[PDB]
Symmetry: C4
Subunit: 91 residues, 4 copies
């Protein structure tokens, strides 16, 4: 579950990294950063896609990627950080 | 369910597209982009409504549209991407 | 329930409106707009508090106000828009 | 529960405050502010990490910290503000 959500999140972020570095001309790390803050809804206060292709892609990317990213965050905390903390609350 | 949430999400986005292109003078694609990142809470780091009508509309648009948009995202992932992935996890 | 969440959301937004217009010097509508996009997590890409008092207040405002605002959105959609749409799905 | 989530949220914010003030050169209050709006997904419309170390750290910080911060907000409202309001609804 967590492994598949992890793999799935990685693939979605790789696609965004390739898209923004190619179409929007961002350095790969900046494309990855933009993909991450976009799908987590944090957003970036400096950059917004400048091309129409970039705007359309971003719209579709958000709708398809938000659910998955939050599912991963949802499990990464409930099935990986909770116990590591819950079990660690046992005297 | 997914079909109605899909239709309902589309109508909400069409209203925002018409509103921002008319009152805030945005090109339609930019108005659609702003509507999408606003209702998904991603936000835009470059544009904020410049008119008071735009600010009031945005406030009301957020309260009314956020629930619907996330319900759609909630189903688009649970009832359309999960199985397509879950059923695909079957050896 | 919806009435109390509505009243409670209004009071929280009035406090933010008074705070930002006084301490950060924003016009009331801009202070209300900032309060709304902050508590809904949309954010504003143009304005961030400029004073240390404003930054501290914003931090506390977010932690205390986010839960309430989303509870209101949660009910405004589940107990006020769903049926109005659900009951309207009945042939 | 609320006490542990409170302590855990504080430690996560202290780490971000130390990181951004050191690597990104922000004044401590600005580093704390950035950490808070980032983990709550509000975002900041003015500042984005300028260094690659800062961008990578922010990506990891978001994935690890978002779940915890929202769990805290989730309990701070359900187990600390609801009753204080619910019990106060009793004539
Ligand atoms: Ca900006
Ligand atoms: Cs945001
Ligand atoms: Na958000
Ligand atoms: Na934002």
């Amino acid at each position: 579950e967590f492994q598949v959500l992890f793999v799935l999140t990685i693939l979605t972020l790789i696609s965004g990294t390739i898209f923004y570095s190619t179409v929007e001309g961002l350095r790969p790390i900046d494309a990855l950063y933009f993909s991450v803050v976009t799908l987590t809804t944090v957003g970036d206060g400096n950059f917004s896609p400048q091309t129409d292709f970039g705007k359309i892609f971003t719209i579709l990317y958000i709708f398809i990627g938000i659910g998955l990213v939050f599912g991963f965050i949802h499990k990464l905390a409930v099935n990986v950080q909770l116990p590591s903390i819950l079990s660690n609350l046992v005297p």
